Design a binder for this molecule. Sequence first.
Ligand SMILES: CCCCCCCCCCCCCC(=O)SCCNC(=O)CCNC(=O)[C@H](O)C(C)(C)COP(=O)(O)OP(=O)(O)OC[C@H]1O[C@@H](n2cnc3c(N)ncnc32)[C@H](O)[C@@H]1OP(=O)(O)O
Ligand SMILES: COC(=O)c1ccc(N2CCCCCC2)c(NS(=O)(=O)c2ccc(CCCCC3CCN(C)CC3)cc2)c1
Length: 411
Amino acid sequence: AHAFWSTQPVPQTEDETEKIVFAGPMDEPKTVADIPEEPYPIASTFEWWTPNMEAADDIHAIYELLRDNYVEDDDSMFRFNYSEEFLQWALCPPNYIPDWHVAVRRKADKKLLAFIAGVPVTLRMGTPKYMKVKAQEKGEGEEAAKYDEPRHICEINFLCVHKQLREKRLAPILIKEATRRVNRTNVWQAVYTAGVLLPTPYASGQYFHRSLNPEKLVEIRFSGIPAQYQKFQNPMAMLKRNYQLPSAPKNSGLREMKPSDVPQVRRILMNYLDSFDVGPVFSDAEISHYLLPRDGVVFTYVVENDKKVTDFFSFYRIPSTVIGNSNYNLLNAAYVHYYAATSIPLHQLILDLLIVAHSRGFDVCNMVEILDNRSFVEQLKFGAGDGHLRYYFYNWAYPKIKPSQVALVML
Ligand SMILES: CCCCCCCCCCCCCC(=O)SCCNC(=O)CCNC(=O)[C@H](O)C(C)(C)COP(=O)(O)OP(=O)(O)OC[C@H]1O[C@@H](n2cnc3c(N)ncnc32)[C@H](O)[C@@H]1OP(=O)(O)O
Ligand SMILES: COC(=O)c1ccc(N2CCCCCC2)c(NS(=O)(=O)c2ccc(CCCCC3CCN(C)CC3)cc2)c1
């Protein structure tokens, strides 16, 4: 049972979700005027705090909270360690709403205890292609297309409650206060991802990873293995050889993205993302914010042929604290972000991703099987991890879709 999620406008079972045939809201239409003006009540020892995510000291406070208390893998080998610079980038895109960055502190000594953040995203979230075919057969095309226009909604991330305050029902209070602040802006849907199963995802995909620095990963994952390399020797030689990469990119035309590339990147990205059921719509300002390179945060390269951008790829950096080990405190991971190929096979493009990442000192490249990420898993030697990413809407009925129909990369 679900004392909190059972009270919310989300599909309550897989079975409920199996039945959904059209996109659209779950709740009663409401108006901003219906929504409480004052913050949701919390106990007298706590206070609401709106950190300024553009202010270095407030960023630092959130940073420490997440560093010590945010997402761990199932075996508690790793905990994300998002950088300060990354936090500022992720939480302050163009037209961001400072009121959507919500924290709780202890009133008496200002100890930071909890956080959640929303940012605006414009998303296509109309009825998916396969359900529209069904609707057309049945003479229900108009009902299936009602919510096809891109919608200005909230993307929620970075929900975190300090370890000392877990399982005290603080997360539901954070979620209700975030909901209220978003609703007060006349927004009624949100999109969110999690590695846990909650009621009820519209899509779910595995994580995949690709070793860039085998010597370091084997030190971390266990002692003297892994299983299928057991017999040789040398298993370490075999492993290094398996994951080895060119030291320079192969694609002539490859260079870092520059601001003048923004219009062309937007055009090729938007044409590609259009082929997916759920996916963002980015303005030029959003393309510039999410894709222009930023030291230690986001890395974006374009293939230019004849002064025209024909392909591009991006990845972003999330270090993880290595919780158990000693030789190594941190794992430097690259995550596949957006890309688009029009002149070369996607595997040839992503190979250059791997080369640049390796060249820049990343230990591993990680991704979810969204977009066309499955198309290069085998040849580029990605292996499935133990993680899954589950995609959810708040207040939006949505038919189940494959993760290959999802084009929103959540940081
Ligand atoms: C229109 C605008 C809408 C905006 C809001 C839309 C909703 C956004 C939703 C948030 C999207 C966030 C996206 C991300 O950032 S996903 C990443 C979440 N963060 C972490 O995993 C960090 C480490 N863990 C923690 O900090 C905590 O354990 C959290 C905070 C996760 C739970 O704290 P705690 O362990 O101390 O528990 P509690 O007693 O306070 O509360 C227990 C209740 O919380 C439900 N629970 C557990 N995990 C999650 C989860 N990941 N999303 C939603 N709900 C979750 C659980 O089913 C139970 O409810 P019910 O089963 O009893 O019913
Ligand atoms: C916290 O976990 C780590 O820091 C982490 C670090 C390293 C990982 N590997 C596993 C294989 C060898 C070592 C390198 C790559 C994984 N693996 S795994 O299979 O890829 C996974 C990835 C991610 C998770 C977390 C669940 C997703 C959390 C959401 C992520 C997106 N938001 C926007 C919301 C939370 C769990 C396992 C994990």
